[PDB]
């Protein structure tokens, strides 16, 4: 079911795997699903919605293979469905879609506006929906973006964020930790308890690092003689990146440390 | 000689083959008058062919955009047959999908 091509726009809120799709495009696209007692009511309500309402079904297929259009709705009995039927319900949230021979699958999220939303981390594209459940399960198991693998607007801020100069007040820390999905729920102890609490950028980023991964990297502006000098461990410019037990003890992150490479935080975590 | 095109309202009775659409927009002459809002699939000019009963061959909107006809022009082509042009006006509001470019870059 090839869709109409539309321009691409960024969306940091969406996950990299997730993809934004408008209501109109999803309405045209249909996903055949086999009705089961555990979800008999779910298909019963969606078919009742009709094609005028977005959460509807374009067609319903009986066991014999006959397709009945839901636009007309001639008889209520025909609307009723039995177990084992196939219903071409319109695409909804949580469905798996695949687009650009290696293709990466995505989880569709419905958004109000028209243009597609992709969490890049422009050019028009057409997203393809796998109708069969078997290939849909296979796509979500091996063709997803996490198994396939940062924007330039984040790497520049990351370097500033991890600078020793950056200090975060209690109010600022709250907002940053709210967006942290992988948060244990406990606020870390401030680095500078007195005269006032002040969390360093690394402390907030320490929770961002998942689990306990240890790696040593160097900042781009790392003098060669610094490593040979007595201050190798205590970097005068914080140009040495060291992580212990998943905590960024020191060092300013950058493309060399956080960006994809032979050795990097993302690569080590993978 | 046997079959010719004409401009008129494609009534459901006189016309055998037709496409599901709203035909109230067309006037008695088969041309939509200026000032009528048109949205989705709608007939804006009526044309039929008297095949050897007539078959509908009207022209619908190229896209589904909602627009209002601005002006209607009726003329005679070089061959002398009746020829008309109509300009459909639509208003596009900038949105998240529109592409904006500076004077350079």
């Amino acid at each position: 079911d090839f869709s109409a091509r539309t321009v691409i726009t960024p969306d940091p809120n969406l996950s990299i795997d997730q993809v934004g799709v408008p209501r109109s495009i999803a309405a045209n696209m249909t996903f055949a699903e086999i009705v089961t007692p555990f979800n008999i009511d779910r298909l019963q309500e969606l078919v009742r919605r009709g094609n005028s309402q977005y959460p509807g079904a374009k067609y319903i297929i009986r066991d014999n293979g006959d397709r009945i259009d839901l636009r007309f709705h001639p008889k209520p009995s025909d609307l009723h469905l039995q177990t084992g039927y196939k219903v071409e319900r319109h695409m909804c949230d949580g469905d798996i879609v695949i687009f650009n021979m290696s293709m990466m699958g995505h989880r569709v999220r419905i958004l109000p506006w028209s243009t597609f939303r992709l969490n890049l981390s422009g050019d028009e594209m057409n997203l393809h929906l796998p109708q069969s459940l078997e290939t849909r399960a296979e796509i979500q198991e091996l063709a997803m973006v996490p198994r396939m693998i940062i924007v330039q607007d984040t790497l520049t801020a990351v370097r500033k964020f991890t600078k020793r100069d950056v200090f975060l007040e209690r109010g600022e820390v709250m907002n940053l930790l709210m967006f942290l999905s992988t948060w244990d729920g406990k606020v870390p102890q401030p680095a500078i308890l007195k005269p006032r609490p002040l969390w360093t950028g690394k402390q907030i980023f320490s929770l961002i690092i998942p689990g306990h991964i240890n790696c040593i990297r160097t900042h781009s502006t790392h003098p060669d003689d610094e490593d040979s000098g007595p201050y190798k461990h205590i970097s005068p410019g914080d140009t040495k990146v060291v992580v212990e037990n998943g905590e960024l003890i020191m060092g300013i992150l950058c493309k060399k440390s956080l960006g994809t490479s032979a050795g990097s935080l993302v690569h080590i975590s993978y | 000689f046997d079959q010719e095109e004409v401009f008129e309202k494609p009534t459901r009775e006189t016309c055998q083959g037709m496409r599901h659409a709203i035909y109230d927009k067309l006037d008695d002459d088969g041309l939509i008058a200026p000032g009528v809002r048109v949205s989705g699939d709608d007939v804006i000019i009526g044309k039929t062919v008297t095949l050897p009963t007539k078959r509908d061959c009207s022209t619908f909107l190229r896209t589904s955009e909602t627009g209002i006809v601005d002006q209607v022009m009726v003329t005679l082509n070089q061959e002398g047959y009746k020829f008309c042009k109509i300009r459909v006006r639509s208003v596009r509001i900038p949105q998240i999908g529109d592409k904006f470019a500076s004077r350079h870059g």
Partner: peptide, 4 residues
Amino acid sequence: KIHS
């Protein structure tokens, strides 16, 4: 593009 989308209306097409």
